[model samples]
Target: MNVTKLNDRIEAKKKELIYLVEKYGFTHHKVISFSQELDRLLNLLIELKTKKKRYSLLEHHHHH
Candidate 1:
């Protein structure tokens, strides 16, 4: 549901991360910060997807 806006942020963060990595390389503090932010967003996406999967699974358990 919230993945609409959440994914928007994720995309923005991803681009920023890529740019940071390219300009500053992987070891700089600034790039590290963006890396962590992007990592956190990806984790959020994974969790949301898993929760939604379980939600649909529960809905299918009705017996005939």
Candidate 2:
């Protein structure tokens, strides 16, 4: 994958994770503990660039 594209996705994911963590606060443990999922999603985001990835990592947390 292009280094620039991967970097962009990483930055975007960081911003998104920040937003969720800030908005929900530490009370929402699921949202706060998403580093792994964010990493996973970031890779997916870089690989699947046709559209934006809008699904929630928190939702995946609930199931597993």
Candidate 3:
């Protein structure tokens, strides 16, 4: 898809994620993880649009 389409998809996903987290009342841990993943994917998409190196949004962190 083109940049415009990708941007729109990203925006839509952001809103969905927000709704899942806020309106659905997800737990703090769940929200943190969800947000991080969403942020990473959004960043990756934008980076790809700019011809930058693509990277996963999932951080390597221990969950206890």
Ranked by lDDT, the better of candidates 2 and 3 is 3
Query: CA lDDT, every prediction?
Result: 0.73, 0.60, 0.61
Model 3 lDDT, full chain set: 0.61
Over 4 Å off, model 2: 26-33, 40-64
Model 1 misplaced stretches (Cα beyond 4 Å)? 53-64
**Model 2 CA RMSD to the hidden true structure, in angstroms:** 10.9
The full ranking of all candidates by lDDT, starting with the best, is 1, 3, 2
* TM-score to true structure, per model: 0.66, 0.46, 0.48
Q: What's the distance in Å from true for residue 24, model 2?
A: 1.5
Q: What CA RMSD would you report for each candidate?
A: 7.9, 10.9, 9.0
Let me know the TM-score candidate 3 reaches against the reference structure: 0.48
Q: Which lDDT tens digits does candidate 3 get at residues 1-64? A: 3445556766887787788877656577776777787787677665665753423222212222
Q: Which has the greatest lDDT?
A: 1
**Candidate 2, overall lDDT?**
0.60
Clashing pairs in 1: none
Clashing pairs in 2: none
- Per-residue error (Å), model 2, residue 30: 4.2
Cα lDDT tens digits, model 1, 1-64, are: 3565767888998888888888899899988888888888787777757787655323322323
